[PDB]
Design a protein around this nucleic acid. Structure first.
Ligand SMILES: [Zn+2]
Lengths: 98, 65, 141, 70, 53, 227, 52
RNA sequence: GCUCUUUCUCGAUUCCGUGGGUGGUGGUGCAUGGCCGUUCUUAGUUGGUGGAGCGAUUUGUCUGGUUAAUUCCGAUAACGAACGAGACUCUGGCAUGCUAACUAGUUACGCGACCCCCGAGCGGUCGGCGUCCCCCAACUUCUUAGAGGGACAAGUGGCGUUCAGCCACCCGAGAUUGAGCAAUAACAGGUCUGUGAUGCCCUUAGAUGUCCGGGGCUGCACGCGCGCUACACUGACUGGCUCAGCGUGUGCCUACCCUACGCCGGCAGGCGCGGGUAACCCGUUGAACCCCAUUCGUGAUGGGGAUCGGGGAUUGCAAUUAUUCCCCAUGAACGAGGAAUUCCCAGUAAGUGCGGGUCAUAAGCUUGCGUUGAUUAAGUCCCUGCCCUUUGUACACACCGCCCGU
């Protein structure tokens, strides 16, 4: 439900591991997609993320009982300092033609 | 046993006999093959309904223009 | 002659004479009180029906072999009149059907062939065609 | 059961109709065919009529469930 | 916590819902579609279904 | 998918994924000239083509919007990393895809001009593009506080039978005006008799063509000549 | 009718499917050549080696 | 560990008032979108230029014959065009012709074998196989589905202004299978209870949000509308007998599929188990009424199978207000149904059975399939209604109209 801090950082790493993070709307499945090994019950991605979206650092979408949350480019600087990771500009963008 | 062939068939057939009147004859089977060669008829059915009017129309023209 | 040239409805009666003449296959302790299916409302009027039932299922093995309990229960079926609701199909009894097949085993009539389907022994066929030589010899349509 | 009978009474006939052509004279067809056709057409010609589809509304093809009037 | 989800729903009409509108009435389940009636009608074209007959 | 699912389910699951993808895609490419996508199982690969005209969004700075949207699919539809990549294409003729017109009509309605000046412009463009016909229907609270309808027509407009399966293109989009929701229906008759950009079953059932005879051009009096 | 009202009117959707099966008797790399250039339409190709 | 009570931690992601309500099967389908139904299953509908009327409007859209059809030929102050019809798609027919088939037929054969004197036959050849084969057999009639092909008032004769066409007949699928598709203008026709499609209002912590528990949506003096069962002897009980076609069926964002075969159990069921992601095993789908025998004997009889008691199993977190299914047993209402009224004209009515759908438990319902197979029509506006034209009107939310006097 609420108040993990050692178990809220878990999603943040995925959110910057790739500039997107898909989800679902069902709240009862602890089988969270994309390596949920840190005991995330599919919440905290539709509880804390509505905070992240409402600030302007990530962007939201809905498609058939789903969410397609996008990390904005200018949210990288915000989510580089709270994560206090090295100064880097590569969430998922090699910035070359693939 | 037969229907009114609508303005599609009547107009299509009248041009054929007006453009290839010499290559046509009395018998339907002869006319069916001729029509396909000289016209791009989209449907098999209507080709046999256009060829139907053409042979009926030739029976008309031999009996007073 | 062969089974495929004689009247079947009287043929099963003919073999119902033979298993009365052998009279040693078995007769189950429950022949009095069973129903022969789950849909009937009254047990057969003839009490000696085991000679009849075993005449049929053994006979059907001669024409569509490889049949187990199911292919013998499927043939034994009819309307299952639930009364107010519409009727249906309901298969015949299971246990009553197999006890025939086991009883034929003791008489060595039928056997479990390859594919685990009851078939008929080459001595078993001799009995079925032999009685055919009698009904055929005494009846011309 | 009846369907099979109306098949065998045709197949057997069309067997002999087809047989007599391939190894016997064509007249042997006509002395038989005409006696066959002048008795029953179906023994030479198959029954084309076959069951047609069912429409929603009506247990059959063209019956209907009744209509309720206030 | 313990009473938030106490319902053993590996069956019943609460288990299956339309995979589009989160609703639970009038469902297609023929081929795993799980969709309701309407969301199938609105999408029959693109799946490959034809109003042909 | 671990026992090689039956053919019926697997083919209908092809459509659903091709259905999920499209409804999601139009929610992002709405401000762009999205038209509709196609996916094929290329040898040991997978490629999804975004048929669009306002491509400058999808091209991405050195290919980043492609990088942004490929990932959001792999994380969702279970695709393994290393075989799914999206390629973009340009629909060189855009005056004949109904979706492009429909959104551009939703585009111009929300932009803040009257419906009557906006629709005829789309109605003109779909004629300056060239089509055997076209039709736009705008329904809702166009004026006042009551629902009316409005209909634009020209050109041939078939309405029944098989040909509508491949000539006529229709599309619906809900516009969110300040007073509620309104709808747009756009229909376009496609002309190509030869193989155009989007090949139809080109001929038309009512069109019966005739060609030049080229006979009796000579009396053909008796002449003999040995080739 | 979606959920509200109407004379009892029913769609009858369809969805057809077909199949063709072939055997080839040669080294199997030659087949992979011919079948590589043909994936262009929406057609399924599953090629076995065990007579399944 | 809701609280009372307090002991443990994530520790500044919690916690309190102001601001914004995300949320909602809450109200308004008389604010809407979209989707359907209906007007209307008939044949109807517009505009460009032209003529008429000052004008609303009109002509084109018709005097006539003709057809399922404003479908034609015609007639013509109108000409040239678009929609609907038709044209198109699917489906059924039949093609002894075509490319093909161990996941189909093969089946005709070789009789390569195996078996019963199993019979005319001393016996072989014959008839049969419940069978057994590898492809180094023969193919494709049936099985499947691709291209084909085929029918078009064509051949002939009548009737017709002798144009459109109709009637009859050898030929044969004689133009004729059934549908899908569907215009103009609308309805304050249904749906905000399908939707992250949505305006406004209601409400948001003592929640109209959600989750959980037990109940209720099914309760009985009543009247209603779709339906299964019969009232019986052409029938019911019992035995034998033999035939079908659409589909359907297992790990999916998710919890369980179809079922042979051997044993236990009367049965309902159970236990090992061996196939199937399927022309492969279910399933050569060896279904029913119907076909042949016994019993019942006009009698509420065994027809009828309601109600009630006792028992025996199944799916499930939970069967009690009985989930289903089995067994014994009670054996009622009903003697072919008033006034009314619906559905139908060919493999249709009508009978019987089987799939799909809902479905953990499952159909008296509905969506489809096949089997058995008529009588009565080839017509008319008499009733309820529809399309076009001529006339009438004090009607225009349009006869469900308007309107008169004590
Ligand atoms: Zn839905």
């Amino acid at each position: 439900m609420l108040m993990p801090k050692k178990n809220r950082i878990a999603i943040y790493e995925l959110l910057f591991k790739e500039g997107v993070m898909v989800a679902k709307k069902d709240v009862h499945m602890p089988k969270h997609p994309e390596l949920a090994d840190k005991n995330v019950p599919n919440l905290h991605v539709m509880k804390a993320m509505q905070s992240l979206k409402s600030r302007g650092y990530v962007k939201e979408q809905f498609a058939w009982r789903h969410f397609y949350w996008y990390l904005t480019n200018e949210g990288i600087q915000y989510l580089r300092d709270y994560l206090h990771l090295p100064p880097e500009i590569v969430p998922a963008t090699l910035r070359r033609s693939r | 046993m037969g229907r009114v062939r609508t303005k599609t068939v009547k107009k299509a057939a009248r041009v054929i006999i007006e453009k290839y009147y010499t290559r046509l004859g009395n018998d339907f089977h002869t006319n069916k093959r001729v029509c396909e060669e000289i016209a791009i008829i989209p449907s098999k059915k209507l080709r046999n309904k256009i060829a139907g009017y053409v042979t009926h129309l030739m029976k008309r023209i031999q009996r007073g223009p | 002659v062969t089974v495929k040239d004689v009247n079947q409805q009287e043929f099963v009666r003919a073999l119902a004479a033979f298993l009365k003449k052998s009279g040693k296959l078995k007769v189950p302790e429950w022949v009095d009180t069973v129903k022969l299916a789950k849909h009937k409302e009254l047990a057969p009027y003839d009490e000696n029906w085991f000679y009849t039932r075993a005449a049929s299922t053994a006979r059907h093995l001669y024409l569509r072999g490889g049949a187990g309990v199911g292919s013998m229960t499927k043939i034994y079926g009819g309307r299952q009149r639930n009364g107010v609701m519409p009727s249906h199909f309901s298969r015949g009894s299971k246990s009553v059907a197999r006890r025939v097949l086991q009883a034929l085993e003791g008489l060595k009539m039928v056997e479990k062939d390859q594919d685990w389907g009851r078939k008929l022994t080459p001595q078993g066929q001799r009995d079925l065609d032999r009685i055919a030589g009698q009904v055929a010899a005494a009846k011309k349509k | 059961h009846v369907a099979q009978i109306y098949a065998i009474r045709q197949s057997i006939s069309k067997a002999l109709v087809a047989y007599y052509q391939k190894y016997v004279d064509e007249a042997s067809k006509k002395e038989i065919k005409d006696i066959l056709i002048q008795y029953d057409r179906t023994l030479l010609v198959a029954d084309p009529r076959r069951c047609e589809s069912k429409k929603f509304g009506g247990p059959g093809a063209r019956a209907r469930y009744q209509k309720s009037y206030r | 916590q313990q009473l938030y989800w106490s319902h053993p729903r590996k069956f019943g009409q609460g288990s299956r819902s339309c995979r589009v509108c989160s609703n639970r009435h009038g469902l297609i389940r023929k081929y795993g579609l799980n969709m309701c009636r309407q969301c199938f009608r609105q999408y029959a074209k693109d799946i490959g279904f034809i109003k042909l007959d | 998918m671990a026992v090689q699912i039956s053919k019926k389910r697997k083919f209908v699951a092809d459509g659903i994924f091709k259905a999920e993808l499209n409804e999601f895609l139009t929610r992002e490419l709405a401000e762009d000239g999205y038209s509709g996508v196609e996916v094929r199982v290329t040898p040991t690969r997978t490629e999804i083509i975004i048929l669009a005209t306002r491509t400058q969004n999808v091209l991405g700075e050195k290919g980043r919007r492609i990088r942004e949207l490929t990932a959001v699919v792999q994380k969702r539809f279970g695709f393994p990393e290393g075989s799914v990549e999206l390629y973009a294409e340009k629909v060189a003729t855009r005056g004949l895809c109904a979706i492009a017109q429909a959104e551009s009509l939703r585009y111009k309605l929300l932009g803040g001009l009257a419906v009557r000046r906006a629709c005829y412009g789309v109605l003109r463009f779909i004629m300056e593009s060239g089509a055997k016909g076209c039709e736009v229907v705008v329904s809702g609270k166009l004026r006042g506080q009551r629902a009316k309808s409005m209909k634009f027509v020209d050109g041939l407009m078939i309405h029944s039978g098989d040909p509508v399966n491949y000539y006529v293109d229709t599309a619906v989009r809900h516009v969110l005006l300040r007073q509620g929701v309104l709808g747009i229906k756009v229909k376009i008759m496609l002309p190509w008799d030869p193989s155009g950009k989007i090949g139809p079953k080109k001929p038309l059932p009512d069109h019966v063509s005739i060609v030049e005879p080229k006979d009796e051009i000579l009396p053909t009096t008796p002449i003999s000549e040995q080739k | 009718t979606p959920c509200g009202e109407g004379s009892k009117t029913w769609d009858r959707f369809q969805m057809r499917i077909h199949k063709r099966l072939i055997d080839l008797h040669s080294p199997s790399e030659i087949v992979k050549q011919i079948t590589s250039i043909s994936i262009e339409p929406g057609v399924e190709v599953e090629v076995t080696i065990a007579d399944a």
